[PDB]
């Protein structure tokens, strides 16, 4: 049963930038019609996988040319001739020649850009929420890069979530919730800001 | 739409996946899951024109695969069901007569969302973020997903829902907004507890 070594697993490039991932079979998976069932997939976030690149080098039909994949034997290449916003995503190649058939584990594609500074925002609690006896108060990071920032509101009473990044910005948005008990019922660090900015 | 089940630690999953007539006449079957942040992985397989089967060795003794002829519909049934099990299970297809045609993945939006707990099932409550930059609180449900939309689909641009936390309760919460400078109503639902809300957001 065949192992199909993706590699790397994940990495960072610039619009512009080639790409270049390999998948290795740890055997020949050429089949014996002279064929290799070899494709390439991609996965933006989050919906289906879609096909790029069939049998090795077939480009599928309507995608652009700057994906192309060759190779021969146990050694096989995905390459974006120049990247783009648009194609932050996980790759994956799937091997079907011989069951049991195999995906490689993926490359994960993240996109460096300019730093943006995040514009923010606060929200005090519904008024529905606090007939709850919960007060959820809410900061939003909108719009920026790169991902670090720092956000302080108190301590161990607040989470955070940060979105995708956006498949045309390649920015950034990012939640921090304060909840305290009802009641009872923000101040940003970060690269593109010469100065932290409360809110 | 997807479902979405939660089962115990150690019982077992049944999934189904419909397709049609030309599928079980001209594809191979196949069941895929892809957990939470991770890579897809092969379960198994089946000919349907055939009736033979293929698994992946991992899980060779916990699932059976099987396709029903008249109804087109094939099906999954992993058992022992662990933490790690916690994935999206869907069907996918590979043509037994011509090369890969892009039309693989069309199930996807069919599959489970399966998630291996002890917690219960909970509806969420939708809060507004009033005002720029308005939105909806999504909290205290289980388990994931909530999906969310803006006027049923018609608000697009310029919206962040971001992917759910687990709180200190077990509960997930969640945030959606979007910028404008018009009404503005939120759609919520989670398909495990019914709710399917609208919020005004003033």
């Known amino acids: 049963d065949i192992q199909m070594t993706q590699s790397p697993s994940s990495l960072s490039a610039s619009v512009g930038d080639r790409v270049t991932i390999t998948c290795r079979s740890s055997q020949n998976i050429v089949h014996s019609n002279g064929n290799t069932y070899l494709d390439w997939y991609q996965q933006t976030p989050g919906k289906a996988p879609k096909l790029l690149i069939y049998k090795v080098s077939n480009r599928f039909s309507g995608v652009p040319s700057r994906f192309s994949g060759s190779g021969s034997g146990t050694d096989f290449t995905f390459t974006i001739s120049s990247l783009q916003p648009e194609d932050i995503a996980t790759y994956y190649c799937?091997?079907?020649?011989?069951?049991?058939?195999?995906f490689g584990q993926g490359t994960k594609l993240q996109i460096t850009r300019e730093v943006a500074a995040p514009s923010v925002f606060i929200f005090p609690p519904s008024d529905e929420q606090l007939k709850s006896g919960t007060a959820s108060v809410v900061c939003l990071l909108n719009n920026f890069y790169p991902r670090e920032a720092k956000v302080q509101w108190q301590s161990g009473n607040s989470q955070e979530s940060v979105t995708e990044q956006d498949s045309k910005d390649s920015t950034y948005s990012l939640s921090s919730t304060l909840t305290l008990s009802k009641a009872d019922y923000c101040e940003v660090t970060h690269q593109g800001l010469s100065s932290p900015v409360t809110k | 739409q997807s479902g979405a089940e939660v089962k115990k630690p150690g019982s077992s999953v049944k999934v189904s996946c419909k397709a049609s007539g030309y599928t079980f006449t001209n594809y191979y079957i196949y069941w895929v899951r892809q957990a939470p942040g991770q890579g897809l992985e092969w379960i198994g397989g089946i000919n349907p024109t055939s009736g033979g089967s293929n698994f992946n060795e991992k899980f060779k003794t916990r699932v059976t695969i099987t396709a029903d002829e008249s109804s087109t519909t094939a099906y999954m049934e992993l058992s022992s069901l662990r933490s790690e099990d916690t994935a999206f299970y869907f069907c996918?297809?590979?043509?037994?007569?011509?090369?890969?045609?892009?039309?693989?993945?069309?199930?996807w939006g069919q599959g489970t969302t399966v998630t291996v707990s002890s917690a219960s099932t909970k509806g969420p409550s939708v809060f507004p973020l009033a005002p720029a930059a308005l939105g909806c609180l999504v909290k205290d449900y289980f388990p994931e997903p909530v999906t969310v939309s803006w006027n049923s689909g018609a608000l697009t641009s310029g919206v962040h829902t971001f992917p759910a936390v687990l709180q200190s309760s077990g509960l997930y919460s969640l945030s959606s907004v979007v910028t404008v400078p018009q009404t503005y109503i939120c759609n919520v639902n989670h398909k495990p507890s019914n709710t399917k809300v609208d919020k005004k957001v003033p």
């Open positions: 996918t297809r590979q043509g037994l007569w011509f090369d890969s045609d892009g039309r693989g993945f069309d199930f």
């Open positions: 799937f091997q079907y020649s011989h069951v049991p058939w195999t």
